[PDB]
Amino acid sequence: GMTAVFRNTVLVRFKHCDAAGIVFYPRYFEMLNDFIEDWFAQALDWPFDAMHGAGQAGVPTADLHCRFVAPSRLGETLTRELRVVKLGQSSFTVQVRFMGPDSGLRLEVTQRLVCVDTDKIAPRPLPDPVRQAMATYVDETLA
Amino acid sequence: GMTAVFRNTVLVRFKHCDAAGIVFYPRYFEMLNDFIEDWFAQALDWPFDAMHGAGQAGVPTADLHCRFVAPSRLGETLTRELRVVKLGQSSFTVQVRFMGPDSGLRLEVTQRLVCVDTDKIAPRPLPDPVRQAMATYVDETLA
Amino acid sequence: GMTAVFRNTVLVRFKHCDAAGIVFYPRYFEMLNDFIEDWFAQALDWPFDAMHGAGQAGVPTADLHCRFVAPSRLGETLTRELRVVKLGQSSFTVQVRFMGPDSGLRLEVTQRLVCVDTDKIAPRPLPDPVRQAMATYVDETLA
Amino acid sequence: GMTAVFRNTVLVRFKHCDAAGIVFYPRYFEMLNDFIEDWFAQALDWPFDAMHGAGQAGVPTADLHCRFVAPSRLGETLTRELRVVKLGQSSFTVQVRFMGPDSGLRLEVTQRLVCVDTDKIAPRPLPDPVRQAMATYVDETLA
Ligand SMILES: [Cl-]
Ligand SMILES: [Cl-]
Ligand SMILES: [Cl-]
Ligand SMILES: [Cl-]
Ligand SMILES: [Cl-]
Ligand SMILES: [Cl-]
Ligand SMILES: [Cl-]
Ligand SMILES: [Cl-]
Ligand SMILES: [Cl-]
Ligand SMILES: [Cl-]
Ligand SMILES: [Cl-]
Ligand SMILES: [Cl-]
Ligand SMILES: [Cl-]
Ligand SMILES: [Cl-]
Ligand SMILES: [Cl-]
Ligand SMILES: [Cl-]
Ligand SMILES: [Cl-]
Ligand SMILES: [Cl-]
Ligand SMILES: [Cl-]
Ligand SMILES: [Cl-]
């Protein structure tokens, strides 16, 4: 449909790979966080620097379900795509897919995050404009 | 009935902690992998050096589900526990819990791994002794 | 002078920073390796995938001297610049500077790497065209 | 003369090892930091949780020099040793050696750290008891 997707690419690097030149799974999760960071800065107008600084806020992960479909290797460029599954006042759920350079699905992950005060930890609502911006990404078929 | 639970501890270190003031979630996954590594070396008699070396094998992750219950902080010692959920010929599913120093649950991850040939990638059966050792960790109540 | 420099930029991310939102030093070294990887792929026509794959080669570090001049923080974009200090048949020495968005020097590192066979470790000469390409980056004032 | 050397061990893990088949060098620096962390907690009575917490302090690195002597591999246990080179009021320089299981030198790093106020960055003197504890590790022969 026309609900939004957020997309970008990531190069599989030497730092990401095991002795076989295949991606070590915790490293996918560094890739995933970088992608969420990007989405916040580019699409939601609430970059992590502002959020964790002046904002005294965070978006820690509550739940994460990841399926590793096919391996990725040193030197491949992967494409990352994000949709929003569910959006509350404080919590939000995204679905992220990583696809290889010939369009093969590499991993699919559904991730629930919660907006919190970091001084000290306690849930809080998302900023209104942020929640409004996320609403455009919502794919009602996903949940 | 009779069973076994594999358990050890890990210190939350500076390298693990982020600008929200807690453990950065990919870092939990490095701690998870370290724990699985420990299990293989210390309980299953199939250390990763041997497995990935002469063994020409690995145990890549097929599926992860992680529930983050409460945050962890610099300087805390966490307890890690492993139980086996399901055991096939090649695939195996484990449940790992991380607990805080007063036993508060921090995270629970259900993870399916698959034994593979690394030369080159293709599923293969676990060694007989290894599967037999893993069977002792089976938690029937999780089935 | 007109000897060459290799340049690119890198965003300081959440994964790079400590609890204060300042870069944790081992993370600079992940940034440094990524930059060398880039230089090999873009400038030297010998990407890490080809090098570690078909090439059965590596460029492990022999020596590294790094001065941390000023701290870097979450959300800053740093500029990375590389020059070649010294070039042998197998060994090569680079100097890398990271500068902040307002041109302040953040870190300066002189790094000696050695071309090796990875099956199994043993020095070898650089490929001729690679060594030729590095020669253009040589700043004879540096050593 | 009378002195002390701080020493402990570390296992080389899957997470540390790369596509050249050895420890990936930034990973040595995470192991270095862990070791300094250990020194502070176990020898100097100033653990990082306390230091960075109530203490509003840190010990960022100003200078690194690392000589990589021989590679390390998955499954090896390394020995880490610390000696103090130089001790000022705020700054301190340490020499750390990593050795293999048959005592072969793997790397030697000379590192200068500086005690700082984190609220906000500005050098400050080490606590008196901490400096006194560090003095016991001084290796006059390295001066
Ligand atoms: Cl590609
Ligand atoms: Cl909510
Ligand atoms: Cl939600
Ligand atoms: Cl593909
Ligand atoms: Cl029984
Ligand atoms: Cl199976
Ligand atoms: Cl299974
Ligand atoms: Cl607890
Ligand atoms: Cl067998
Ligand atoms: Cl049971
Ligand atoms: Cl900037
Ligand atoms: Cl040479
Ligand atoms: Cl050289
Ligand atoms: Cl600057
Ligand atoms: Cl004496
Ligand atoms: Cl001083
Ligand atoms: Cl000093
Ligand atoms: Cl040795
Ligand atoms: Cl004092
Ligand atoms: Cl002495």
TrEMBL record, chains A, B, C, D:
Domain of life: Bacteria
GO molecular-function term, one example from the UniProt record: fatty acyl-CoA hydrolase activity
Gene3D superfamilies xref list: Hotdog Thioesterase
Pfam family, one: 4HBT_2
Signal sequence, start to end: none
Descriptive protein name: Thioesterase superfamily
The species this protein was found in: Cupriavidus pinatubonensis (strain JMP 134 / LMG 1197) (Cupriavidus necator (strain JMP 134))
